[PDB]
Amino acid sequence: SFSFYELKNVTNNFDERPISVGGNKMGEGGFGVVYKGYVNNTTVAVKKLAITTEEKQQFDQEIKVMAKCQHENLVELLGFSSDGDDLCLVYVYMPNGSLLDRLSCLDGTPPLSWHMRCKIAQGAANGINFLHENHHIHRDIKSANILLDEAFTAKISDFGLARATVMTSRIVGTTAYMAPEALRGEITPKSDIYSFGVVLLEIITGLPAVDEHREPQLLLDIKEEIEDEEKTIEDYIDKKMNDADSTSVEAMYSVASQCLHEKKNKRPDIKKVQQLLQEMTA
Ligand SMILES: CC(C)Oc1nc2nn([C@]34CO[C@](C)(C3)C4)cc2cc1C(=O)Nc1cccn([C@H]2C[C@H]2F)c1=O
């Protein structure tokens, strides 16, 4: 447990400037802003939450799922702070930031090699598999919620939407990653698989999941382009790599394609996805 005074103190008073300019801001999600902190001889990440105020519930839920789900491919939650002006979650610092940022080479980081893209996709599937085995649905699988430590091990983060077939009157998620049935209110782990297909296309292409100036705007729509023979896989392979063999890139694309089936019951389950990603680099 942490106090707002101490989290405030170790974040330079929640300095909103980017790290490069001298502040503490590392990024921001839909629901908060993430700051670097240095507390008790340890670098940490501190998310200050910031949707109706009752919609506090997320803070509450994030703590319960972290208690249950601990795994090599899941971010570790260090502590929290409910006292003070805002609420705050403290996590183990992830030295290579998010997969989203490393795919865009944000702040000058080197492009991820194909070999490391392959290991990261396997690691992220392992984290999803752990969640579904423990009867959890993440509901916000995306490359911004896959973080990378100093070994480039993938760790799933941001459990504020996770849940323990069923409809909800409160649809949540990130639209550019969301399966059709999840957009329409369904709660199923089959939807996490769909979102993971989009993440696999980010990893293949280096492109963001949505781009209003791009044709097509939604990355998941390049699957139909390739199927229609309007483009090839090769047209979309990230050029910022020189170790991407054709065979294994097409193999991961095929995985991404099966994940992106419109009909949830035609999608592979996470165990099949794990097996196929394993076979890719075997
Ligand atoms: C993605 C962004 C928000 O976080 C980070 N960006 C970073 N960039 N760099 C560098 C180093 O060299 C560079 C050139 C790349 C800058 C290091 C980073 C560490 C973090 C971090 O540890 N971030 C989280 C840890 C734990 C959890 N969560 C999420 C729940 C939310 F809080 C995190 O976000």
Curated annotation (Swiss-Prot):
Its EC number is 2.7.11.1. The modification Phosphothreonine is found at residues 165, 168. It is found in: Cytoplasm. Phosphorylated. GO terms for molecular function: ATP binding; interleukin-1 receptor binding; kinase activity; magnesium ion binding; protein kinase binding; protein serine kinase activity; protein serine/threonine kinase activity. It is an enzyme of class 2 (transferase). The modification Phosphoserine is found at residue 169. Keywords: Acetylation, ATP-binding, Cytoplasm, Disease variant, Immunity, Innate immunity, Kinase, Magnesium, Nucleotide-binding, Phosphoprotein, Serine/threonine-protein kinase, Transferase. One of its GO terms (biological process) is innate immune response. Transmembrane segments: none annotated. Its cofactor is Mg(2+). The keyword Acetylation applies. ATP binds at residues 26-34, 47, 142-145, 158. The active site is at 140 (proton acceptor). It catalyses: L-seryl-[protein] + ATP = O-phospho-L-seryl-[protein] + ADP + H(+); L-threonyl-[protein] + ATP = O-phospho-L-threonyl-[protein] + ADP + H(+). GO terms for cellular component: cell surface; cytoplasm; cytosol; endosome membrane; extracellular space; extrinsic component of plasma membrane; nucleus; plasma membrane. Residues 20-277 form the Protein kinase domain. Associates with MYD88 and IRAK2 to form a ternary complex called the Myddosome. Once phosphorylated, IRAK4 dissociates from the receptor complex and then associates with the TNF receptor-associated factor 6 (TRAF6), IRAK1, and PELI1; this intermediate complex is required for subsequent NF-kappa-B activation. Direct binding of SMAD6 to PELI1 prevents complex formation and hence negatively regulates IL1R-TLR signaling and eventually NF-kappa-B-mediated gene expression. Interacts with IL1RL1. Interacts (when phosphorylated) with IRAK1. May interact (when phosphorylated) with IRAK3. It is linked to Immunodeficiency 67: An autosomal recessive primary immunodeficiency characterized by recurrent, life-threatening systemic and invasive bacterial infections beginning in infancy or early childhood. Belongs to the protein kinase superfamily. TKL Ser/Thr protein kinase family. Pelle subfamily. Serine/threonine-protein kinase that plays a critical role in initiating innate immune response against foreign pathogens. Involved in Toll-like receptor (TLR) and IL-1R signaling pathways. Is rapidly recruited by MYD88 to the receptor-signaling complex upon TLR activation to form the Myddosome together with IRAK2. Phosphorylates initially IRAK1, thus stimulating the kinase activity and intensive autophosphorylation of IRAK1. Phosphorylates E3 ubiquitin ligases Pellino proteins (PELI1, PELI2 and PELI3) to promote pellino-mediated polyubiquitination of IRAK1. This is Interleukin-1 receptor-associated kinase 4. It comes from Homo sapiens. The lineage of its organism: Eukaryota, Metazoa, Chordata, Craniata, Vertebrata. The gene is IRAK4.
